Amino acid sequence: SLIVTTILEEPYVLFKKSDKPLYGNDRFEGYCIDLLRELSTILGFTYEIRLVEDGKYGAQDDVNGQWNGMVRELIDHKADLAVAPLAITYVREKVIDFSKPFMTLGISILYRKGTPIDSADDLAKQTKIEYGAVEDGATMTFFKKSKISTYDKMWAFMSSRRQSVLVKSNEEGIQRVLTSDYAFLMESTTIEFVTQRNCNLTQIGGLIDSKGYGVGTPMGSPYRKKITIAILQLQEEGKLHMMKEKWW
Amino acid sequence: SLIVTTILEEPYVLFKKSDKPLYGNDRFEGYCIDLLRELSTILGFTYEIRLVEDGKYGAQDDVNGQWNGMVRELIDHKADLAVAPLAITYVREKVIDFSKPFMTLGISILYRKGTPIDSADDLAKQTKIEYGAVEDGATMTFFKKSKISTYDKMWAFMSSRRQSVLVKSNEEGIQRVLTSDYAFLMESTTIEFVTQRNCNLTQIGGLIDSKGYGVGTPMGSPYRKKITIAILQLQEEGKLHMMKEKWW
Ligand SMILES: N[C@@H](CCC(=O)O)C(=O)O
Ligand SMILES: N[C@@H](CCC(=O)O)C(=O)O
């Protein structure tokens, strides 16, 4: 029986709401839970869903070099699989493995409708409107690592206001956009979900980069190849697209 | 020194234009040639480019299960890497390895402008207008394997006329569209290139599936991880996007 680490994030993973108490895997639903069920059936494994203890996606600590979040769990073999909206990035590929992508996306900007702000550039060159990203996430790590002028500038702004502009979760980021003058750097897939339920919010500009979500495994896992093949099958039969339409 | 198999296909790989003849790697230019050079610079390997002998991408024989094209080259270890617009698919992943995708895309339809035809369904429900794909390619294999009713139907049409509607190359397919009542099932990236150079041609409908191109390697190759890491670096620093702008 495989240990699967994941994280609460609508509409990928959320607590099923019901009248009666729910236990184990039954507590959860969402796109990634659907995915996990398909993978379990194809590859023929049983599993236990465990929410990542520290509630993080995964980043390397600057000072001690230690990883956190789901990535860390994989590193220490505390989980067999990470099934979640986990971005495939070059820093992560150095320490874990990923299946081929089950979804493609890009960093973009979440802000309110009807403002002059039309790009990351517009944001970088002012200080009135604050902006940030999820702490210890792939988006924050992009900006932290970027050599591109505009993004280095935005990272300088973010790190100096770290206290107020880097959030613990997408939901906190969205809440800031709703309740203050704040633009949120987040993934385009999640933005599409958010703007479908908040008719006063929109995506600003296009995609800042391009990346995929993949299932994470410890480096050298024998499951990576099997999961990659299952994902490509799900993709080709239209099942991933069907799952996205269901949850968005 | 690495042997790298590839195939002619604009604008990914083409013979460079010149006054005096060229020799060796110098003969080649294109998107995938630039990609190969960047990989070479990052990983530090030397290489010799060889055009795939049979001029095929790679498909599997139904009866004996033997592969051809670039895929076979990799299986038989007659090449170290395949750098070309080689589609990541589940049947190929069973026999070779791919890096993470350096480009994402999807099957679509190339046809002429100003017609009533608006989707695959329109082609499927008639016979006057012929349609086909490159023989022994990922697109043809998609139709051959599909259980989606529309595509299954299109495959029954294609296979019964395989002699007349399946072509040896994208170039032959395009030529077919230009000289007869024929719609060509082909990859969206290439369609985008082609329609820029022929004003009477257009894409019909949206993307039929979603897939990526990957650098192919013989199964188990240590270069898979390194190239994946490198492709992600190139992607994140915006170099892959520049390369696409350059050739499209
Ligand atoms: N999906 C991201 C977290 C959210 C973000 O960074 O925008 C990750 O894998 O780390
Ligand atoms: N890029 C395709 C060939 C062209 C096609 O099938 O449309 C492949 O890897 O097989």
B239: its two tokens:
């170099």
Instruction: Output the residue whose Cα is nearest ligand 2's atom 3.
Output: B137
CA distance A68 to A71: 6
CA distance B240 to B233: 9
Q: Which residue has the tokens 């329609």?
A: B195
Tell me: is residue A162 an annotated ligand-binding position.
Answer: no
Cβ of B236 within 8 Å of Cβ of A145? The answer is yes
DSSP string covering A64-81: T--B-HHHHHHHTTS-SE
Instruction: Output the residue whose Cα is nearest ligand 1's atom 4.
Output: A137
Paired residues of A6 in beta bridges: A51
The answer to whether A188 and A106 are in contact (CB under 8 A) is: yes
Tell me: is residue A124 an annotated ligand-binding position.
Answer: no
Alpha-carbon gap: A235 to the closest alpha carbon of chain B (Å): 7
- Residue of A104, A236, A240 best to disrupt the B interface, most CBs of B under 10 A: A236
Same domain (yes/no): B114, B198: yes
The answer to whether A166 and A135 are in contact (CB under 8 A) is: yes
Cβ of A90 within 8 Å of Cβ of B229? The answer is yes
**Alpha-carbon A211 to chain mean position:** 11
Please give the C-alpha separations between residue A238 and each of A25, A202, A217, B151, in angstroms, as whole numbers.
Answer: 25, 28, 24, 12
Q: Which domain holds residue B51?
A: 1-105+211-248
CA distance B46 to B48: 7
Same domain (yes/no): A26, A98: yes
Q: How was this structure determined?
A: X-ray
Amino acid (one-letter) located at B34: D
CA distance B197 to A196: 38
B83-121 in b/e form (b: 16+ CB < 10 A) is: bbbbbbbbbbbebbbbbbbbbbbebbbbbbeeeebeebe
Same domain (yes/no): B84, B204: no
Cβ of A88 within 8 Å of Cβ of B100? The answer is yes
Same domain (yes/no): B202, B158: yes
| Closest listed residue to residue A150, CA positions, set A196, A190, A208 | A208
Resolution (angstroms) stands at 2.1
Name the interface residues of B facing A (CB cutoff 8 Å): 88-90, 93-94, 98, 100-101, 104, 142, 145-148, 209-212, 225, 228-229, 232-233, 235-238, 240-241
Amino acid (one-letter) located at A3: I
Same domain (yes/no): A134, A119: yes
Same domain (yes/no): B101, B223: yes
CA distance B165 to A202: 46
Paired residues of A216 in beta bridges: A82, A98
Amino acid (one-letter) located at B236: E
Same domain (yes/no): A16, A57: yes
Q: How many beta-carbon pairs below 8 A join chains A and B?
A: 68
Could you report how far apart the first and last alpha carbons of chain A are, in Å? 30
CA distance A237 to A234: 5
Tell me: is residue B101 an annotated ligand-binding position.
Answer: no
Is B186 a pocket residue for ligand 2 (Cβ < 6 Å)? yes
Tell me: is residue B133 an annotated ligand-binding position.
Answer: no
Same domain (yes/no): A94, A174: no
Same domain (yes/no): B221, B179: no
CA distance B69 to A22: 53
CA distance A11 to A246: 10
Using CB atoms, which residue from A94, A98, A237 is nearest to B147?
A237
B168: its two tokens:
């040896």
Residue A173's domain is classified under what CATH number? 3.40.190.10
CA distance B206 to B143: 16
In this structure, are strands B2-6 and A81-82 parallel, antiparallel, or unpaired? unpaired
Ligand nearest to the CA of A96: 1
What's the number of domains chain A is made of?
2
The answer to whether A110 and A204 are in contact (CB under 8 A) is: yes
Same domain (yes/no): B205, B169: yes
Atom of ligand 2 nearest to the CA of B140: 6
Q: How many CA atoms lie within 13 A of B107 on its CB side?
A: 24
CA distance A189 to A143: 19
| Closest listed residue to residue B7, CA positions, set B197, B138, B169 | B169
Burial class (CB in 10 A: 0-12, 13-18, 19+), B7: buried
- Residue of A38, A90, A221 best to disrupt the B interface, most CBs of B under 10 A: A90
Amino acid (one-letter) located at A209: D
What is the 8-class DSSP label of residue A17? P
Same domain (yes/no): A71, A169: no
Instruction: Output the residue whose Cα is nearest ligand 2's atom 4.
Output: B137
With vertex at residue B212, the alpha carbon angle to CA A169 and CA B142, rounded to the nearest 5 degrees, is 125
Please give the C-alpha separations between residue B244 and each of A61, A107, B37, B114, B237, in angstroms, as whole numbers.
Answer: 34, 19, 15, 29, 14
Same domain (yes/no): B116, B184: yes
**CA A87 to ligand 1 center in whole angstroms:** 6
Sheet holding B107-112, edge to edge: B130-132, B182-187, B107-112, B201-204
The answer to whether B69 and B59 are in contact (CB under 8 A) is: yes
The dihedral built from the CA positions of residue B154, B157, B163 and B164, taken in this order, carries a sign that is: negative
Helices (H), A99-238: 120-124, 138-145, 149-160, 162-165, 170-179, 188-197, 223-236
Using CB atoms, which residue from B211, B232, B238 is nearest to A89?
B232
Contact list, B241 vs chain A (CB under 8 Å): 210
The answer to whether B194 and B57 are in contact (CB under 8 A) is: no
Could you report how far apart the first and last alpha carbons of chain B are, in Å? 31
| Closest listed residue to residue A213, CA positions, set A105, A108, A90 | A105
CA dihedral of B189, B192, B193, B198, whole degrees rounded to 10 = 150
Is B11 a pocket residue for ligand 2 (Cβ < 6 Å)? no
Contacts of B29 (CB under 8 A, 6+ apart): B13, B14, B15, B16
Atom of ligand 1 nearest to the CA of A86: 9
CA distance A223 to A79: 12
Amino acid (one-letter) located at B117: I
Can you point out the beta strands (E) in chain B? 2-6, 14-15, 28-29, 47-51, 81-82, 96-98, 103-105, 107-112, 130-132, 182-187, 201-204, 211-213, 216-218
Cβ of B90 within 8 Å of Cβ of A237? The answer is no
Rg (CA), chain A: 18
